[PDB]
């Protein structure tokens, strides 16, 4: 079986990630009583370029048969939540759109889309906005995350 771990992710500004819809995630600060709403990811180690600073991963939602993916939509790299066949996932060789390059930078994590280099899993500085794929060089949007094991 493919090597995986159960974890939560919080952005640089400590916002939690929640399942706002059947195929959507949102980021917002969660008070001590609403913490349980945060999504638990099952992060798998897929095939690709091995490095202590950059490793290929797939981000699934624990026991939900949902994976994050990046696809081109109207010429724009777009983050999606896709339902998968429970009998075929997780697998070592994932379809290219599911692969993220996990980067360890300044005691934080960045998730670069493997097929869209320079595009990262991002959050808005504002509250309760969807999690998206961002390509901005360094400004308004957050691309840095902390990981907490489950």
């Amino acid at each position, epitope marked *: 079986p493919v090597r995986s771990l159960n974890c939560t992710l919080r952005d640089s500004q400590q916002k939690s990630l929640v399942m706002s819809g059947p195929y959507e995630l949102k980021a917002l600060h969660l008070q001590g009583q609403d913490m349980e709403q945060q999504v638990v990811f099952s992060m798998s180690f897929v*095939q*690709g*370029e091995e490095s202590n600073d950059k490793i290929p991963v797939a981000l699934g939602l624990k026991e939900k048969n949902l994976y994050l993916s990046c*696809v*081109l*939509k109207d010429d724009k790299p777009t983050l999606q939540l*896709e*339902s*998968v*066949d429970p009998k*075929n996932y997780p697998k070592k*060789k994932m*379809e*290219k*759109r599911f692969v993220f390059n996990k980067i360890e930078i300044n005691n934080k994590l960045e998730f670069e889309s*493997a*097929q*869209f*280099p320079n595009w990262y899993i991002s959050t808005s500085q504002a509250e309760n906005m969807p999690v998206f794929l961002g390509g901005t060089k360094g400004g308004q949007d957050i691309t840095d995350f902390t990981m907490q094991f489950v």
Partner: antibody
Amino acid sequence: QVQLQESGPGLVKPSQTLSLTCSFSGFSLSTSGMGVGWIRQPSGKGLEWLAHIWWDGDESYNPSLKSRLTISKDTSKNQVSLKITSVTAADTAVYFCARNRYDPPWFVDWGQGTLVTVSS
Amino acid sequence: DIQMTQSTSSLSASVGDRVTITCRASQDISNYLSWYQQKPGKAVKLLIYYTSKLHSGVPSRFSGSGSGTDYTLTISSLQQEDFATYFCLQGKMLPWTFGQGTKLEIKR
């Protein structure tokens, strides 16, 4: 603009290895997201996906013949090769190469194809 | 493997007819479907991608629809040059699989 062209030996004996080449121009296979696939069509039958290779060398194969296939790229010659070992009369077909950018693949440009007959 | 099926193997239709070609996936393919046209003595051409997006250079009489498992390629007003075999392809899961193809003949 973009062109793909298949070449190969035309006639091969059963149990031999078949080597096919996809010569391409008008794009670089080292460009992020770029891919080249091989598809075949036996006489009177439909299209069958065989193999694929991404810009980063990640190979994909159809399990119905994965053990017999090898796909490779040469970005210095702008060529994608397909090697099929232990061929049989079931491998007689027109072989095509096609390109895409990103997953899921939309095969935007296809070659004219190369006919391979497997016979003694 | 996701099985792709095209219930019509061959049919004939008249110039001007609204032609419908169906493709059914064995499981949810999340609109990751594309349509290809194969003409005699010519390289296969992409017509429609991501269920409904028209490939650049393809006439507007070609359109695509569907979701989940059921998909349709429509030719609004059939032309004599539309004689070809049409194949659907799923990109949801490896191995990528094609429909068996639908050969469309022109009635005259």
